[PDB]
Amino acid sequence: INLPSLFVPLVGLLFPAVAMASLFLHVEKRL
Amino acid sequence: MRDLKTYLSVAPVASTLWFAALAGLLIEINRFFPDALTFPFF
Amino acid sequence: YGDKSVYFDLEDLGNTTGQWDLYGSDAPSPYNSLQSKFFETFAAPFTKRGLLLKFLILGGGSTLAYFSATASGDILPIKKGPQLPPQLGPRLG
Amino acid sequence: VEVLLGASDGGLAFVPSSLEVSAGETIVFKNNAGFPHNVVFDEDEIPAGVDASKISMPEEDLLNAPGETYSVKLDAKGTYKFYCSPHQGAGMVGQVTVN
Amino acid sequence: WVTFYWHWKHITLWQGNVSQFNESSTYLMGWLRDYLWLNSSQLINGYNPFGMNSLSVWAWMFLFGHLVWATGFMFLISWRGYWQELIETLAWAHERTPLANLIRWRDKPVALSIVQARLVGLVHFSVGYIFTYAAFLIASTSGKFG
Amino acid sequence: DIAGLTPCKDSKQFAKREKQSIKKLESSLKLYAPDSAPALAINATIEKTKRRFDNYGKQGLLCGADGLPHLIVSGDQRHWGEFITPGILFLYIAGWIGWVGRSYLIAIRDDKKPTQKEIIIDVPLATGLVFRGFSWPIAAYRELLNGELVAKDV
Amino acid sequence: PEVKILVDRDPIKTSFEQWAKPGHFSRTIAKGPDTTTWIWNLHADAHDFDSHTSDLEEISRKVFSAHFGQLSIIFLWLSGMYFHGARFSNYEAWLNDPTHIRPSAQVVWPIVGQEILNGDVGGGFRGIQITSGFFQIWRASGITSELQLYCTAIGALVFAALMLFAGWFHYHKAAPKLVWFQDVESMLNHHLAGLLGLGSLSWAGHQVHVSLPINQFLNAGVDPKEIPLPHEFILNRDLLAQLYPSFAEGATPFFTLNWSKYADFLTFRGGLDPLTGGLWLTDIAHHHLAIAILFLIAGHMYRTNWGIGHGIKDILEAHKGPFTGQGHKGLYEILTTSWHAQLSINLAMLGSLTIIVAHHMYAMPPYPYLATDYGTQLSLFTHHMWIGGFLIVGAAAHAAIFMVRDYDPTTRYNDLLDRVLRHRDAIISHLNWVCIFLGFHSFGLYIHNDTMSALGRPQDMFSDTAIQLQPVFAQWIQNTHALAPGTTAPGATTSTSLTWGGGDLVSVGGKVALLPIPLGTADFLVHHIHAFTIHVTVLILLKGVLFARSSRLIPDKANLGFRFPCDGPGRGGTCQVSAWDHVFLGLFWMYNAISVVIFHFSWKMQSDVWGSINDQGVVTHITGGNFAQSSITINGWLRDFLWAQASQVIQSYGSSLSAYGLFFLGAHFVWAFSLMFLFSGRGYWQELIESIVWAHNKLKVAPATQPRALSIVQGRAVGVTHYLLGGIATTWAFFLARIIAVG
Amino acid sequence: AWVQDPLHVRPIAHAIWDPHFGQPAVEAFTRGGALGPVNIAYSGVYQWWYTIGLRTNEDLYTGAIFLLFLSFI
Ligand code: CLA
Ligand code: CLA
Ligand code: CLA
Ligand code: CLA
Ligand code: CLA
Ligand SMILES: CC1=C(C/C=C(\C)CCC[C@H](C)CCC[C@H](C)CCCC(C)C)C(=O)c2ccccc2C1=O
Numbered sequence A: 001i002n003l004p005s006l007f008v009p010l011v012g013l014l015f016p017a018v019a020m021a022s023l024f025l026h027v028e029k030r031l
Numbered sequence B: 001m002r003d004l005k006t007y008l009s010v011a012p013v014a015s016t017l018w019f020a021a022l023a024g025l026l027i028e029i030n031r032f033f034p035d036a037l038t039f040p041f042f
Numbered sequence C: 001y002g003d004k005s006v007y008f009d010l011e012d013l014g015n016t017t018g019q020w021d022l023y024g025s026d027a028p029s030p031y032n033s034l035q036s037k038f039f040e041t042f043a044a045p046f047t048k049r050g051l052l053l054k055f056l057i058l059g060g061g062s063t064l065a066y067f068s069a070t071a072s073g074d075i076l077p078i079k080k081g082p083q084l085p086p087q088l089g090p091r092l093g
Numbered sequence D: 001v002e003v004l005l006g007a008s009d010g011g012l013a014f015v016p017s018s019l020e021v022s023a024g025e026t027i028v029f030k031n032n033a034g035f036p037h038n039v040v041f042d043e044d045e046i047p048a049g050v051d052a053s054k055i056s057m058p059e060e061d062l063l064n065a066p067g068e069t070y071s072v073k074l075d076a077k078g079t080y081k082f083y084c085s086p087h088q089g090a091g092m093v094g095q096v097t098v099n
Numbered sequence E: 001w002v003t004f005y006w007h008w009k010h011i012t013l014w015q016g017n018v019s020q021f022n023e024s025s026t027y028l029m030g031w032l033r034d035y036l037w038l039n040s041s042q043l044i045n046g047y048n049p050f051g052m053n054s055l056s057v058w059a060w061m062f063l064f065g066h067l068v069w070a071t072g073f074m075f076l077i078s079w080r081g082y083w084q085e086l087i088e089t090l091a092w093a094h095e096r097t098p099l100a101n102l103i104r105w106r107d108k109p110v111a112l113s114i115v116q117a118r119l120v121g122l123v124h125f126s127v128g129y130i131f132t133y134a135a136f137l138i139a140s141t142s143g144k145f146g
Numbered sequence F: 001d002i003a004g005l006t007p008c009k010d011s012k013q014f015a016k017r018e019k020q021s022i023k024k025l026e027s028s029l030k031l032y033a034p035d036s037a038p039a040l041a042i043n044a045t046i047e048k049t050k051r052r053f054d055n056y057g058k059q060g061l062l063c064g065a066d067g068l069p070h071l072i073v074s075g076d077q078r079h080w081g082e083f084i085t086p087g088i089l090f091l092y093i094a095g096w097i098g099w100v101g102r103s104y105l106i107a108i109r110d111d112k113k114p115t116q117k118e119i120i121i122d123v124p125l126a127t128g129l130v131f132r133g134f135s136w137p138i139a140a141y142r143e144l145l146n147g148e149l150v151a152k153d154v
Numbered sequence G: 001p002e003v004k005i006l007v008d009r010d011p012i013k014t015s016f017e018q019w020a021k022p023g024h025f026s027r028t029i030a031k032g033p034d035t036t037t038w039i040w041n042l043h044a045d046a047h048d049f050d051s052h053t054s055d056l057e058e059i060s061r062k063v064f065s066a067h068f069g070q071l072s073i074i075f076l077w078l079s080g081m082y083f084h085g086a087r088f089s090n091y092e093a094w095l096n097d098p099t100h101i102r103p104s105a106q107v108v109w110p111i112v113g114q115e116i117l118n119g120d121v122g123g124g125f126r127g128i129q130i131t132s133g134f135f136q137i138w139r140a141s142g143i144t145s146e147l148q149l150y151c152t153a154i155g156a157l158v159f160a161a162l163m164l165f166a167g168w169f170h171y172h173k174a175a176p177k178l179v180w181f182q183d184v185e186s187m188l189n190h191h192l193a194g195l196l197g198l199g200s201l202s203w204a205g206h207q208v209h210v211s212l213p214i215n216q217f218l219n220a221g222v223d224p225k226e227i228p229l230p231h232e233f234i235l236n237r238d239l240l241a242q243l244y245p246s247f248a249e250g251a252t253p254f255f256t257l258n259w260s261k262y263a264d265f266l267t268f269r270g271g272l273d274p275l276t277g278g279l280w281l282t283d284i285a286h287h288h289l290a291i292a293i294l295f296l297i298a299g300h301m302y303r304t305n306w307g308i309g310h311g312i313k314d315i316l317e318a319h320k321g322p323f324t325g326q327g328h329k330g331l332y333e334i335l336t337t338s339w340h341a342q343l344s345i346n347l348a349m350l351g352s353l354t355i356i357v358a359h360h361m362y363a364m365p366p367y368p369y370l371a372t373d374y375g376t377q378l379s380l381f382t383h384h385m386w387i388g389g390f391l392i393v394g395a396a397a398h399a400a401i402f403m404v405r406d407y408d409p410t411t412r413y414n415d416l417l418d419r420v421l422r423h424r425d426a427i428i429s430h431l432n433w434v435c436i437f438l439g440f441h442s443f444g445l446y447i448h449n450d451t452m453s454a455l456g457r458p459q460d461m462f463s464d465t466a467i468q469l470q471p472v473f474a475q476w477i478q479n480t481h482a483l484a485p486g487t488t489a490p491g492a493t494t495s496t497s498l499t500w501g502g503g504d505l506v507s508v509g510g511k512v513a514l515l516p517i518p519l520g521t522a523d524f525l526v527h528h529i530h531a532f533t534i535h536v537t538v539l540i541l542l543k544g545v546l547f548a549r550s551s552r553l554i555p556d557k558a559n560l561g562f563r564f565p566c567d568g569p570g571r572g573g574t575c576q577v578s579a580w581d582h583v584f585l586g587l588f589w590m591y592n593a594i595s596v597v598i599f600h601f602s603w604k605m606q607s608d609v610w611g612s613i614n615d616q617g618v619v620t621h622i623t624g625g626n627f628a629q630s631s632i633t634i635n636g637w638l639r640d641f642l643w644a645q646a647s648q649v650i651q652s653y654g655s656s657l658s659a660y661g662l663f664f665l666g667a668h669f670v671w672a673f674s675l676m677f678l679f680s681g682r683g684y685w686q687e688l689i690e691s692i693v694w695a696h697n698k699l700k701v702a703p704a705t706q707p708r709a710l711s712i713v714q715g716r717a718v719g720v721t722h723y724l725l726g727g728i729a730t731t732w733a734f735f736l737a738r739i740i741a742v743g
Numbered sequence H: 001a002w003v004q005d006p007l008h009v010r011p012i013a014h015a016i017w018d019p020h021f022g023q024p025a026v027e028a029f030t031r032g033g034a035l036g037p038v039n040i041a042y043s044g045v046y047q048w049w050y051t052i053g054l055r056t057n058e059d060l061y062t063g064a065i066f067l068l069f070l071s072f073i
């Protein structure tokens, strides 16, 4: 219920993980 | 002698002698009139 | 290739360029069928690229959110909060 | 009466800055944090007599090590203002009075 | 230089001690001792073997800015060829080892470009500069709040 | 006075600093023998300090709240001895040096190998040239008016 | 085959013709200067004899004569030392009361108010305190008056003149031929026996006759001027008999092999002398006697003229195994035809030897009243450390020079070198991995401790009170050393050094000379830091040497030479691919490593060794043992070491140490100035010089010798020179001011 | 709270939620009368917003919503 507790991991761990995975996939493959 | 004169006027040697003379002159001037912060004569 | 001292031939470029596998086994499965018949059947639903990626991402995210939003006081001192009165600044406070 | 040179937070101040002591007592200036700390007595705004070297440290000495004390017996009616030569510009100035 | 001058003048004025600046500004040792060394005690004491206080975050940043800046000196002094040869031998080593040659890079590793290396070195230099000075200024002014 | 400063002769912090300096010097003297070489050196230094402070008071320098002399360079005629006549002296000497060097460079510029006379200074010619710097203020002025100080066609 | 003396008469006639022509050695340089760059080149290749010519004989003759010149310079330096000690020093006052007076052997004339530097050093003297440790050497040698110092100075001056004349005579009148220089067996035999062994025997003979009786009288409390002169102890032998009875028999114990009777002055005590705080002189004399025997024996190994002996070629070629093919075959021909190979080997060995000398010299002080002279100890250690590091880096420089220039498999082929050049890639890759691993675990632990402390989690730190990293191996070794005397080495009474353990603290004049040094977690961390830095600098130097000739980037790097800027911006950029640039980077990393080593030594000594003893035996250390708990974080190093100990130097103004503060600031300036050269390129500077030169052309005052900007390699060299000077000088000023004010 | 006594209270920027903090860090960083570790603002926004007329948290919320709309536009 503590709003910071939910979001700090969400923006510091989940968001960078998904963003780095997606950008690595985009940058690193022939189109 | 002639070659001694020639080498004795080469850039490094001439510069060191000139700067030694200048240093001595400035040292003596400071010694006679030390702690001079202004020109009081006129 | 390998006749005596020759180390080059256009017929077999793979061998010429050293395209070998230094340690490939080329041997049959050391597992008996029964064990493999279990592993390949229970681990089957995790062998899809997109499905596995999406499931891993969202499941890990939800697990992290749940474990961080419901942490107990003995876990993280950050959320247990302060337990002392606050001091004053040199003149502010 | 013990007073510590420098605060725990690294502040360059005495602990207490102002010392009101009774005569027959000697101040020990123990080192705390921010050392090397030096205590030097003013020589000016100081009562009647009391020569400076008696209670000063050489203007070129510093107490070292976390726990080193400087012992001064004082014993002379009036007030004495002391300060730290290195940190005198940071507000490390104190004052001791004997009433 | 501009901000050093401003901050020293204002920190000595806020203490009612403008004299001190007047005496010690004329020579460089005054700047080094009475300003940098003198106003840097609470900051470096932000955390010590006897605990930490609210300034610790700055004391850490103060060191962080010292590190970035220093690693900036790397890209500015060492240049490309050395790193290129080192990366070549690294590529050989990775390609020659068991179990890891099963993993293959897809873009050939190369040393940073000359212009890119200059830019990265300058960026490190600037980030370290800014972070260390910001830590020092905020910790020293906030340490005294005056 | 100018800029809120006061003359050093009647200033008080200047005298206090003078006394403190002499006290510091004397503190060391009492340790040695009364008439040993170190004692004589320290006494000579003390006399030098006293003479310096007396001279500074004599010349009429301005002292600030710090008690130290301050130099006025706005151009006030009461202070031309602080920057303007030393400035004129420096300009004369520096123009002497530059004019002599330029004369040497121009003199040796006509040989087939001028660089030889540059790493090995032709002292005979230099000794004749150095004395032109006595009157360089006139030589340079007429050099400019005659229009050959500055290389035309460039 | 035989060893004999071969020379040539009047190879070069002394004259002044070449003095008038700058740069006679190079034809183009001899022609004259076209641009200012010429001038720099003239100096950059002054002593590069192997490039001015290709004849080995001429190079060898030039090397021999230059050696004579440098030996003359050293002798002049020593004569200056002894003269300054004789006239401008308070040596006798210090001799009367060592602990009381601070040694000083330099005064400054009073000219511009600099006489403030003539500080109060005690003994009715005012001068500049010296940290060279000459007073201790003179006391250990038995010098008591200034007449002896004057005589030594005059003799050293005469020997400097003799060295200079020898250099002139050997280069211009009688120049040895090549076969003479290539005779390495006899050279090794003479240097091992004629120089080292015989010299050690001579010094032992001096110590038995002069050092021992004189120092015994001095330690007995006799005033220095009342002691019999050193020669009397030779004329009348009862003088020696009184101090040590065993001199009564005189030599007969030595010839009947009753050597035990000489136990009086030839002992195996160990430890320190409790009165002077140095090694027992009766141990040093025995030391030099044994060393003399060992070297006089070892100098009889190689065959010269009488059949008996060893041929170095035979020894080398007799070694070879299945892993190295025919290794060691051909090395004799490599090491007798290339000077750079020998220079690199000797430079590496001398650098390592100097480092070991520093370690052993602060471990067990060998001179009286040296241990408690903290300034002398610190200065000597730091000086020797820096000298050794520089020599080691030069070793790599010259190995690379040899590799580029004199290595030739067509005529001089060696198998081991070939195999190394063939698996250099594996060597460098593994060394790179080791460097990364050490860097992460040594420095990463410091960063971890710093982060934990900043977050208020001291329980998670790598400290002696949280997570301990105890050097069990070092503790075990020093414990075995402490138990050594009486167990494994029965003949010794005290352990080799007091740093091993056993208690028995030794103090002199109220100051701690030495006591056991404890090893904890901070010591573990700093030692691993040392290993990391040494490995990284070795990586740089070894990579420079191995890849000097060719690589996968530039397959013809040897054709470009040992020294060159680059190979253009092709292949992505080939900046600093030459071996000289690898030495240039190795210099920075050597500076880093040595700075950390000296910082560790200084802080550890101040925290856990140096200090003042009191009546009850309570040792108060200069720093109250804060190294163990403060050195484990970078913030502690910045606060409890640099900030805390810089107070002494920064305050030095207004006193006799003001020169140290001036040099502190000036060294900072020069170091920051170096970055000007290290960060820029010569293109910008040449473009700016174009506008400057135009401004000069406008006034008919442009130089004939065109002013070019510095070459790329010269820019790098200037940058590294200024960087090293500034850093080393600021550390020098810091150390000297701190230890003179607090010591 | 700041507008009540501008001279004797430190303005707060935002709260800290760092799972790496230790207990003493949490104790040391709770200032300004907050219920947890917070950061003391030095951008000077408190004085600026006070001078222009903002007094309550509702005004700040309305400004934030208006600016979100503005960025969307
Ligand atoms: C650029 C402005 C900005 C900045 C610098 C921050 C910074 C911060 N916010 Mg925050 N936030 C913002 C706007 C901003 N916020 C807005 C407009 C809202 C909606 C009113 C929120 C709602 C919010 C909540 C509920 C929380 C934070 C929290 C935090 C802190 C922890 C990290 C975090 O949770 O990520 C931010 C979390 C979000 C949910 C942000 C979503 C809102 C914006 C629109 C996202 C922007 C994404 C966009 C693609 C990139 C912007 C451009 C550029 C900056 C990259 C951190 C100091 C946490 C905290 O309190 O710290 C302890 C917390 O729980 N924020
Ligand atoms: C005493 C008279 C004398 C004279 C007239 C000459 C004349 C000559 N020598 Mg010679 N030489 C002498 C003494 C002399 N030498 C001595 C005593 C030695 C023993 C060291 C040598 C060893 C020697 C060698 C090995 C060589 C010569 C060479 C030469 C010829 C080339 C130019 C030259 O001399 O170099 C330039 C003149 C200089 C003065 C250069 C400076 C050298 C000194 C030693 C520097 C001092 C070091 C200083 C302390 C460094 C610290 C710097 C600090 C002050 C800032 C020339 C004809 C060279 C040659 O013949 O080429 C084929 C050659 O290779 N000489
Ligand atoms: C007892 C025999 C002996 C001794 C004592 C020495 C001693 C020395 N040699 Mg030497 N050498 C010898 C035999 C000897 N050599 C033989 C037989 C050969 C031919 C294979 C060589 C070939 C040789 C070369 C090529 C070189 C040396 C060098 C050196 C010096 C090395 C630097 C040093 O440590 O300085 C120590 C300083 C001292 C000990 C000070 C005292 C010096 C005394 C006076 C030396 C006198 C010894 C000499 C051999 C006497 C013969 C000459 C006689 C006609 C007067 C050193 C002085 C190097 C050099 O030039 O020196 C810089 C060097 O390049 N030697
Ligand atoms: C006995 C030791 C020794 C000897 C005999 C040599 C001999 C030689 N070296 Mg070498 N070297 C050594 C040690 C030694 N080195 C060490 C320890 C290092 C590591 C630093 C190096 C690194 C090195 C490099 C990188 C190079 C050489 C090169 C050379 C050759 C030419 C050097 C030359 O004359 O250039 C000219 C010499 C100078 C211009 C003198 C430099 C002046 C220095 C930088 C100033 C010192 C400042 C002073 C200490 C303090 C300030 C004083 C000032 C303010 C007044 C020559 C055969 C060069 C070569 O090409 O090999 C063939 C070359 O590239 N050396
Ligand atoms: C502060 C300045 C600085 C730093 C940090 C470094 C660091 C390094 N240098 Mg170096 N160097 C510097 C200045 C510096 N240098 C300068 C000014 C020069 C010019 C002379 C050089 C010239 C130079 C050369 C020629 C070489 C190096 C090499 C190296 C590397 C050695 C490998 C190692 O240590 O492993 C590990 C790395 C470290 C211990 C550095 C710190 C790592 C931290 C503790 C890890 C933190 C991880 C953290 C969890 C990350 C999460 C953050 C996330 C948000 C991304 C290393 C990374 C050598 C090399 O590349 O090795 C083969 C090499 O050959 N340097
Ligand atoms: C270290 C170094 C290299 C080698 C540098 C390499 C190989 C970079 C390796 C860095 C890796 C990729 C990790 C870096 C982590 C970064 C913090 C990630 C930034 C990525 C985005 C967030 C921008 C050069 O190539 C070079 C070239 C010319 C002059 C100087 C140098 C130089 O100093």
Ligand code: SF4
Binding pocket: E114, G565, G566, G567, G568, G569, G570, G573, G574, G575, G576, G681, G712
């Ligand atoms: S920047 Fe300089 S060193 Fe690098 S490739 Fe260009 S010219 Fe060569």
Ligand SMILES: [Cu+2]
Binding pocket: D005, D006, D012, D036, D037, D038, D084, D086, D087, D092
């Ligand atoms: Cu203090």
